[model samples]
Target: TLDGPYQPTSLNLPVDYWMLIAPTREGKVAEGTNTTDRWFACVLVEPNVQNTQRQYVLDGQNVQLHVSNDSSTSWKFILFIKLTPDGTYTQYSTLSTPHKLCAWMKRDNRVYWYQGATPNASESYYLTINNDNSNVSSDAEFYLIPQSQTAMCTQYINNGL
Candidate 1:
């Protein structure tokens, strides 16, 4: 995650909208869904800054999603953040449309999703990370197949949604 002030002029703008970051084995990414299962990390860019020291306030002028793949296989993934009504359950809102925030393998190496703008502020938000991979090894081991869905789901469910 970005943790410092980003000067629009100093940062390098992305020419492409999305980029992919997948882990490779011996500098080679494996094919097929079953072979691409691996763990990778992602970060979301937000417009607002909560703690300047702890978090980064993105330049509302342009925003992007930086992704890194640290596995030995290439993988496809989608990144999204959702905001729901305070006490509403099923009535939820998505930051970006489905499939709109997706990235595929780029040169069998790094990939990124560039929004090129800061995100709108909301009361509460959560990140939904998903990958297109089959044959998840073990649930206990935490394979990269939609294995993690961290959010303020409790706030929505407990309140109503």
Candidate 2:
């Protein structure tokens, strides 16, 4: 154990986080005058729970699945732990919301989602691990696909986006 680093949804969750939204049929948006090949959203997951940061470590690594408000409204965050290419995405985590103590989070358990694989784009159901309602205002049909290791992540953070 990580000396008791367990955490539930709270106000401290990252709201202005960001993600790299690669253009695709499922992740399409109206063509803006300044639209790029891809786009960025100012939102994403807050670091809740434990053992989630062990991307390349942890003997018994748990899944890094958590949610962030990122917006005012409610948006369900999910992690598709299992996928069978043309099969259903049943095995996954529904990290409800970080709005408050009882405002959000999954009902089952952490291991329920972590005791499986991470995620993939080609073989996975969705490239997005986390999502929010930030797109709702823009008339977008999809959520965000947060890129942890990217220049935009920091760039947005730098500009206070």
Candidate 3:
């Protein structure tokens, strides 16, 4: 169990390279030999409900998970907490339109978090976790739960995730 400050995703969520395709927008042509177009494929999380998402953390100490986002007025981190006292684990980070979880593709072999609006089904993505590593026997998945329910946190912790 992640009993301390180092709670982080135990497994790296695998994503398809095709989903990382960037969108074509104004002033950006779909193709050009020397044209500079910005394309990014990311995993998107919606922020409309409470206690509905999960993101698992590794069972270790002093390990760090960095989630990146664009908030001009503040910095944010995913809130990791146990979903229940019966060995269930869950985490939270309140999200909203233009302020939801937007994870860029893996870097250095780890999935990192950032914030952005929801994209169309083709442009957005849904990845898989807890795949073939069944023997490991750890928490199931990382989720986006309710941020308002601090009661689940119980402990006084900073948002240094």
Candidate 4:
């Protein structure tokens, strides 16, 4: 449930302009289906500012989905904001260090923040499956095995695929 600003008054950016914060945990992460421990939640990263490294991810839970559909169920895009290269925060902490976005299936569609450049077994967290226009969690049907997925901004959201 990341819903906060990066550094309220540290930068010249507006409070609303800051990206919504998503919290991540520490656990095991793997590629494809993580049968041992997995998480799946499609997340999107959008710009919080113009042409800046600042970016953010949206929460999938808050989205209202009466009847799941590709367009309606998928995690909506949100304002993205970054901090001084790397900082840290909680439920909206400083972006001081490098990290990755992860999600798990059984966790009731929770997204995790992996502290690293990429996902590895050493670290555990949730994942967001930005696969095509599917958001029913079934679009990522294979994720049923309690698998996990990883996502990153990398200057290109492209639907976070």
Residue 137, candidate 4: how far off, in angstroms?
Answer: 5.6
Candidate 4 regions exceeding 4 Å error are 1-42, 45-102, 107-115, 119-142, 147-161
| Candidate 2 residue-wise lDDT, 92-130, digit = tens | 443233221111111111111111111211111223223
Q: Indicate the worst ten consecutive residues by lDDT in candidate 1.
A: 138-147
Task: State model 2's lDDT.
Answer: 0.23
- Candidate 1 segments whose C-alpha is farther than 4 A from its true place: 1-41, 45-47, 50-104, 108-112, 118-161
What is the lDDT, from 0 to 100, of the residue 107 in candidate 2?
16
Task: Choose the strongest candidate by TM-score.
Answer: 3
**In model 4, where is the ten-residue run with the lowest total lDDT?**
137-146
- As a whole number from 0 to 100, the lDDT of residue 114 in candidate 4 is 27
Would you estimate the TM-scores of all the predictions? 0.17, 0.20, 0.21, 0.20
* lDDT of every predicted structure (CA atoms): 0.22, 0.23, 0.24, 0.24
- Flag regions of model 2 displaced more than 4 Å: 1-75, 98-161
What TM-score should be assigned to candidate 2? 0.20
Q: After superposition, how far is residue 103 of candidate 4 from its true place, in Å?
A: 3.1
The positional error of residue 11 in candidate 3, measured at the CA in angstroms, is 14
Where's the lowest-lDDT run of ten residues in candidate 3? 26-35
Tens digit of per-residue lDDT, candidate 4, span 32-105: 22222322223332222232232222222222211111232222222121222232211221122222233222
